[PDB]
RNA sequence: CCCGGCGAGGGGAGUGAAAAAGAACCUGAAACCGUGUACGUACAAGCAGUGGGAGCACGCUUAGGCGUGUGACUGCGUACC
RNA sequence: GUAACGGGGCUAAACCAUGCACCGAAGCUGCGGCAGCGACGCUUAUGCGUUGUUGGGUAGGGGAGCGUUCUGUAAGCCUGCGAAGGUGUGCUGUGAGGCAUGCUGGAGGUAUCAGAAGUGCGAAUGCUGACAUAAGUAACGAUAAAGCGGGUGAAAAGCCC
């Protein structure tokens, strides 16, 4: 009962190497380095599912800041304003147009500054 | 339309053919044959007789004329290498590989 | 395997081969390691367990309606071609025929087909009874099988 | 036109013409989504509010796909200690298309 | 078909001339740096930056106004004996007024490559006299 | 035709497996056995 | 010195990029013969500015 | 029938079901060396990967940054045993 | 080579006194998906609803499945009306794996379900094969050297003369 071997594992190779295309050099054509690359890939990927959302959030706060200060007080008082004002959600994703033409929403910023009690 | 000339088991290595090959790369037949004869490397005579077969067999029975054809492909692959053991200082019994090339020229109208 | 008086390990203290005898299983041809083994792990079977499995399957062959028990399919002559026109007339083809009579005219007939087959009831076993589309037997075999099962 | 609303339990910024994916709904494909929990509309416009369930202001949408996702894999790993293990998950979703925004 | 996301197509620079006057070296310097990343107006995208093209034409001719000079004198390898040869803080003023202003905004930008992509948008020169302002940009006080 | 229809209860079957194989699976390091000494490295089938 | 890994095939292409030998351009005619030559140099078997050249 | 030196080696033409069967000829990975297209590389760098992406071909993206293949640029980030 | 804030920069943008804020983790939390199992309801051979702590994991214990070589139905059935083999992609499952399909391909293939094993390689300075690598880099065998016309020849400073 000889076994010839290397047909199931050959399919595991071709699956590793299929997922490892669009990668550089030996990663896209040799098993060993392909495997190495695949395990590092899916770990970074799974960091970045959550992590994109941390990184982006800075960019939402930094666009809102330049508007918010132009419409009165500065970002951290405005956010405490939104916390104090009733029937009103506090959030840091309220506007994408705090980037350019930042005179809009002045009335929401004055609602928070007044409400900052 | 298209014709292969090869020379297989030829006396070059591919490091030695590539110097000549990038000058004549996709470069039209007539201009490449002018550039080639002003290269006095051993590889450059080899590729000459092989370009001349490429152009000439096309003017019959697949086509006609020689001026209008272009060198669409120019390439080298590893032929079968002969291994020898070299006698050498201090009793060293090192490998020498006697490389050959398989040289392909392809011409077509293109 | 063609050496014991020769080690490929002969004062190792450099970067070298791990094998150290020329008959190793990790040699290209050397006699591999998990070899010369048995092809099943033990074989006996308890008598009550063997004889009681044959009772079980036998009840099921009646529960699947494979039995209708027909004695003597035999004719005047041992030719298959006569028996097979006999089996077509009884409307039971492709059947496991069990003889208890060892009649040469039946055993040497009904065999020229890939599913028409005749056997003797001797040295019964659980694997035989389950083969082929149905098992028809003769009443002579049913006596002679029942006493191996009881 | 740009807008913020509160749905499910997140707040989300969005434009007009936009196809977005959200947390699963009951609404089938080819039947209306409408959001009264819209927190403000802001497109060059001065506005008072941050208020939910506001009445006059709606974001109208539609379902464009209700599905289940293609198999993702998550790999859990620590070097040097011979630790490697793997799981899969899909998550169900709705895609909606924003064909709304009123103020 | 995706989530709302940012991209390099939505942000621009234009040209700004900073006529902010008589203003202290570092109090000039963090505001220019702030705008050379962009932050004073926005920052939206993770991969590129808001930015301005910045000419300084005013307030290029005052010292650090403190002690930073004497504990960070920017030594380099350049070949010596007995010691090491260095640039001095003192050299910088005598060979055009820019260099004091210049290593105040340089040092305010990130890493290697991004800090360089940002940096190449600043111009400063001799200051209050420099021809490299003929455009007449958007005027600005900070 | 009740042939190739055998199936018994759980725990009474090998189900085509041998162990000590893969470096992702968990069997890259030893399992069902220990480590170090003459107990589990080369052997153990010569200590009484 | 020795190395520390196997190098790249992108390197092999890079090191021979600035080495390969030059040529004159355009298929020549000559003032005194239908013979092609290397330009601004004696026609190898014919007339270029009177006389012929070469032996053996 | 073509090229060459008496040569080497290949094509065209014709054989055949097939020469993507041309003689090491079964179908044929992967190492192996080179061409051809698309897009890319000259303010430009590090486990070469992940997240974000101008742009270019093809998909009316339901143009609202998407599918597919690539990708100036860049946030983030230390191989496996 | 600053290099004892991580750096620019800050003679207040520091430090201290009173006090307030914000940003800041898969944490705490909401939306949506999902695993097994306690408690209670329906009430069961087979499960489901409410509710619930829960689901990072080596050493090491314990349980289950896959396919490869081969066996039984396979004695059947599918096959040049396009099989194995190669290759891209979609689908599917927790993973292995499985399944579909255009191109390729011109003879081979198959469950269910049980069962044997020379049973899957990426490591052993393991053994063997093809062949890559730094590199067109280094080496020019006592430096008994060479010249140049003709010729056998395709090709000649070095051969023959």
Curated annotation (Swiss-Prot), chain B:
Gene Ontology biological process terms in this record: assembly of large subunit precursor of preribosome; cytoplasmic translation; cytosolic ribosome assembly; response to antibiotic; ribosome assembly; translation
Binding site for L-tryptophan: 90
A Pfam family that the UniProt record links to this protein: Ribosomal_L22
Gene Ontology cellular component list: cytoplasm; cytosol; cytosolic large ribosomal subunit; large ribosomal subunit
Keyword match Ribonucleoprotein: yes
Documented effect of changing residue 8 to C: In strain: SK1048; decreases translational rate, tRNA binding and subunit association at 44 degrees Celsius; does not alter 23S rRNA or uL4 interactions; not erythromycin resistant
UniProt keyword list: Antibiotic resistance, Ribonucleoprotein, Ribosomal protein, RNA-binding, rRNA-binding
A molecular-function term among this protein's GO annotations: large ribosomal subunit rRNA binding
Subunit structure, as described in the record: Part of the 50S ribosomal subunit. In TnaC-stalled ribosomes forms part of the binding pocket for L-Trp with the leader peptide and uL4.
Family, similarity comment: Belongs to the universal ribosomal protein uL22 family.
Entry protein name: Large ribosomal subunit protein uL22
Organism of provenance: Escherichia coli (strain K12)
Phylogenetic placement of the source organism: Bacteria, Pseudomonadati, Pseudomonadota, Gammaproteobacteria, Enterobacterales
Swiss-Prot record, chain D:
A Gene Ontology BP annotation from the UniProt entry: cytoplasmic translation
Family annotation (InterPro entries): bL21-like (IPR028909), bL21-like_sf (IPR036164), Ribosomal_bL21 (IPR001787), Ribosomal_bL21_CS (IPR018258)
GO molecular-function term, one example from the UniProt record: structural constituent of ribosome
Keyword rRNA-binding: yes
SUPFAM superfamilies per the UniProt record, alphabetical: L21p-like
One Gene Ontology CC term in the entry: cytoplasm
Keywords noted in UniProt: Ribonucleoprotein, Ribosomal protein, RNA-binding, rRNA-binding
Listed Pfam families: Ribosomal_L21p (PF00829)
Assembly description: Part of the 50S ribosomal subunit. Contacts protein L20.
Protein's job: This protein binds to 23S rRNA in the presence of protein L20.
Assigned protein family: Belongs to the bacterial ribosomal protein bL21 family.
PANTHER family: 50S RIBOSOMAL PROTEIN L21, LARGE RIBOSOMAL SUBUNIT PROTEIN BL21M
Name of the molecule in the record: Large ribosomal subunit protein bL21
UniProtKB/Swiss-Prot annotation, chain E:
Record protein name field: Large ribosomal subunit protein uL13
Biological-process GO terms, alphabetical: cytoplasmic translation; negative regulation of translation
Record-linked InterPro entries: Ribosomal_uL13, Ribosomal_uL13_bac-type, Ribosomal_uL13_CS, Ribosomal_uL13_sf
Function, as annotated: This protein is one of the early assembly proteins of the 50S ribosomal subunit, although it is not seen to bind rRNA by itself. It is important during the early stages of 50S assembly.
Lineage per the UniProt record: Bacteria, Pseudomonadati, Pseudomonadota, Gammaproteobacteria, Enterobacterales
Family listed: Belongs to the universal ribosomal protein uL13 family.
SUPFAM superfamilies, A to Z: Ribosomal protein L13
Subunit structure: Part of the 50S ribosomal subunit.
GO molecular function, one term: mRNA 5'-UTR binding
Keywords: Ribonucleoprotein, Ribosomal protein
Entries under CDD domains matching the protein: Ribosomal_L13
Organism: Escherichia coli (strain K12)
NCBIfam families: rplM_bact
GO cellular component: cytoplasm; cytosol; cytosolic large ribosomal subunit; ribosome
UniProtKB/Swiss-Prot annotation, chain F:
Coiled coil: none
Biological role: This protein binds the 5S rRNA. It is required for the late stages of subunit assembly, and is essential for 5S rRNA assembly onto the ribosome.
Region (Disordered) residue spans: 1-48
Family: Belongs to the universal ribosomal protein uL15 family.
Protein name as catalogued: Large ribosomal subunit protein uL15
Domain of life where this protein originates: Bacteria
Subunit note: Part of the 50S ribosomal subunit. Contacts the 5S rRNA.
Signal peptide: none
Biased composition (Gly residues): 21-31
